[PDB]
Structures are given as C-alpha cells and as structure tokens.
Amino acid sequence: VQLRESGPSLVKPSQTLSLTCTTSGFSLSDKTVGWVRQAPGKALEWLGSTDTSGNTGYNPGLKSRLSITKDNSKSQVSLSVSSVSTADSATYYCTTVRQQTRKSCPDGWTLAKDCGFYGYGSEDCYDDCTDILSSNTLSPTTTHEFNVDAWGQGLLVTVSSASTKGPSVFPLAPSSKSTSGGTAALGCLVKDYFPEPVTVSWNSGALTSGVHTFPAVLQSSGLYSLSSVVTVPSSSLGTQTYICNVNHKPSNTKVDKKVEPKSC
Amino acid sequence: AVLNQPSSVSGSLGQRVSITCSGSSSNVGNGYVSWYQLIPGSAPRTLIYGDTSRASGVPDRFSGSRSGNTATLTISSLQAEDEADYFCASAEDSSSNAVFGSGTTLTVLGQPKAAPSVTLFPPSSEELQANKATLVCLISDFYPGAVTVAWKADSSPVKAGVETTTPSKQSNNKYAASSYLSLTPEQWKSHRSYSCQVTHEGSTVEKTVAPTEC
C-alpha cells in the first residue's frame, strides 16, 4: 500500500493549486482517501476526503475553496485549492483515512441493526429485540470516528509570484589541509534554487555511510541553498570517484557533479 | 479550534514521557482520539487510533489513554529513535471534519557530549568563474545542538553576508549545522584570510582559509 502525490511545486497567488494522488497496493473501491497539509512550523491541517460511495467531505473552514474528486479505475484521487495565497504554502500529504459515523446505545439497549429490524425505523435503540412493536425505543448516541491509516511521503508546494529557478552545483573539494587523518570531508554546494526542495545522493545512492544533507538556508535574494557532505577514507581520494546526484523536481532538473580533489 | 498540546516535552532515555492533548466535548469528548509521529524526512507515522489501540507495527512502549476531554500519549521507556513531533487528532461534529493538535516536540536527552569537527571550504573555481564566492563552514558530530558561529576577515568582524542554519540531527543522532559567507570575487581576493570560529562547550575551533592558495 502506497500513496504518491504529483503536481506542481510552485503556484502563483490567486490561481488554483491542483494535485493528484496515485494509489497502489490496495483497491480504491475499498478505502477512503483524503489530503492532509502542514505549513512549515505549523500544525497539521485537514483538507477533505472522498469515501467508497464517492461522497466527499471537507474542512468546514476551507470547504468553499476545496474540490476533491476520484476515479476508482485509474486509482487516482485529486485535490484542488482555489485562489491560493502564501498561507496555502504547505507540504500536502495523501492519506488513506478511516471515517465512521458510529451509533451506540445505552447499556441494556440495542440498535435496530443488531436486533435485525431494518425498515424505516432502522436507526433507533430498542429495549428488547424479542418484540419490535411493543419494545421501548431510544434515540442512539452518535460518535464520529476519524483516523489516517497510511501516509504518503508528501509533496511540498510553494505559493509565490516569483519564478522557478534551478540550482548551481559547486564542488566542496577536500584539500590536503582540510583532512582529518584517515577521513576527509568532501561535499557539494547547491546554490540559488527556488522553490524547495532539493535532495542529494552520492554515487547514485551507492554511497550512504557518512552522508548528511543539511537543511536549506533562505538568503536575502529569495533563493534557497544547501550543502551535502560525506566523510570518506582519505587514502581513497584518488582511487574512488565521488559524484553527488542532486535532484530538484520543481524544475525537473537533476545534476551530477564530480568532486575532484584539490592538488593541495 | 486546534487541540491544545504542550509546545515541547523533555525526557531522558529509559524514563517515562507523557504528552497531553486537551480539547472539548465535541472533539476529544467524542472518545476517539488518534496520535501520529512525524520524524523529519519521513512520512508521518500513525501511532494510536482507537483512543488506546495501537496501529500496525507500533511497539508496545507507546500507549494511549483518555480522561474526559484530555487524551494522553505515553511512552514507557524513551528511546533515541523516539525524538520527534507528535500530533493528536479527533473528529468534530462529523467524521469528515478532523481537528489536529498544536503539536509537541519531544526531546530525548541523555546523549553523550560530543565535540564538533569543523571544515571550511573556500569558493571553488566554478563558483569564482561565475562571478561569485561563497565560503562554506560545515559543522558536524556534536552534542548538544547549540553552537555559535563567527566569521572573521583578517581577524575583524564580518557583519554581513552570513546565513546560518539551525542545527539538525544526522543519521547517528548527533547534531550538524552549516554557515555560509556570500562574497563577491573581489571581496575574496581582498583579504589575506578568512576564519570560521565555532564555539561549542567552552571551546572555539577556528578554521582558516586563504585566497593566496588553498
């Protein structure tokens, strides 16, 4: 079971953001799906969902601006937010949700469904199912149950009038004066790029030990930059090539940079 | 509105930790609260759903409870992997209207103290041949997560051009941070040397880099 968000990473104000979640591992005709979003440094926020019966419900405060649809054949849920602002910048998560309106009866009483009654009065609590027509009746107690079952990885969407910009990748070469005897730190500077995010791997994933991709800084220019470093054996600086594989989906860009060792 | 959780909560390894999630009757009073775990760089993780019931894959040290309009998440023996953010959630007036809590940042104290290893990178040829210069000071493998970074040009203060990240964990649960000095290639060649000075736990490590050579 997996949920993969797709769509734009940047959206100008007053326009309409639209995402699509493609589902696998299960059958969309057997689960409810929804959308959660989280603004940076803010709490989770609920958007909406659409259940097995194609019925959609929304965050009351955001219903007028929301639109969720679904295609059970294409295994694909869709979200749309209208007239977005910078407040709509957030990471948008696709989720399988468990929504249940639950009716329960006091102790000793029983619901019509459990009595096996059905009909028009199929929603009351009964004193004894032994006699439907002479039993005492209570209105049920209503509890609403909500769970997010599985979470999608998320998709960061930024709302800004500024334009997309890919990254410049500069090597952080390890000098013979920046070694630490046995180990040496080399990296890649990912400079000037918008919007977030950037991800960095090394040797096409085949190098994992010692790696740390730092968070991004927001320069005064309105562009983001970060660095990815890995500490490697200092004896291998001439015998093992080290390539950082940067990836910036917001501009469909992907960079590979040889980090060559400084002559000194 | 949102469910009131504590901003942050602390707890040392092995100890017991509890996170409160207070609301009202229409939401938390409805008796079906859920708890989720968010580790940075990982998809949020569902922990507790049926007020007390554990989801699939959840260890038994996690446990849920509720007393009226205040839920509670309880970790019996805190681990290092348990350092993260934790959100409660409840439906209000309908199953399609969900409210989340303000969130709580859980800190796992008790890690060994560690001293930072600092490296300073001068502007590269590539970055220079494009009319830019950026010095990259990378700070790793230290605990606790509170460093002070100072930039000096010929031992004088750099009062501008500095963007610094807040420290964040790495795969080994130690902290790491980064500071940048953004210069024109003329300010690079202007001075004799630049210095990144990292003060962590009464020590100051200064790495120096010179335009003359390497």
Residue numbers in the entry:
A (entry chain H): 2 to 82, 82A, 82B, 82C, 83 to 159, 161 to 263
B (entry chain L): 2 to 9, 11 to 27, 27A, 27B, 28 to 95, 95A, 95B, 96 to 106, ...
From the paper:
Ultimately, we isolated a total of 8 and 11 cross-clade nAbs from cow-485 and cow-488, respectively, all of which had ultralong CDRH3s, suggesting only ultralong antibodies were responsible for cross-clade neutralization detected in sera. BnAbs from cow-485 were named Bess, while bnAbs from cow-488 were named ElsE and assigned numbers based on their order of discovery.
The ElsE Fabs all have CDRH3s with 54 amino acids and 4 cysteines, with a 1–3, 2–4 connectivity, Bess7 has a 61-amino acid CDRH3 with 8 cysteines (1–6, 2–5, 3–7, 4–8 connectivity), while the 55-amino acid CDRH3 knob region for Bess 4 (6 Cys, 1–3, 2–5, 4–6 connectivity) has no ordered electron density in the crystal structure. Ultralong bovine CDRH3 knob regions fold with 3 short β-strands connected by 2 loops (Loop1, Loop2) of varying lengths that can adopt a multitude of different secondary structures, including loops, helices and β-turns. The ElsE series of Fabs all have highly similar knob structures as expected from their high sequence similarity. There is no convincing electron density to indicate tyrosine sulfation modifications in any of the antibody CDRH3 regions; however, BLI experiments indicate that Bess7, with 3 tyrosines in CDRH3, contains one or more sulfated tyrosines. Low sulfate occupancy or flexibility in the CDRH3 knob region may explain the lack of electron density for these groups. The ElsE lineage was the most potent and broad overall.
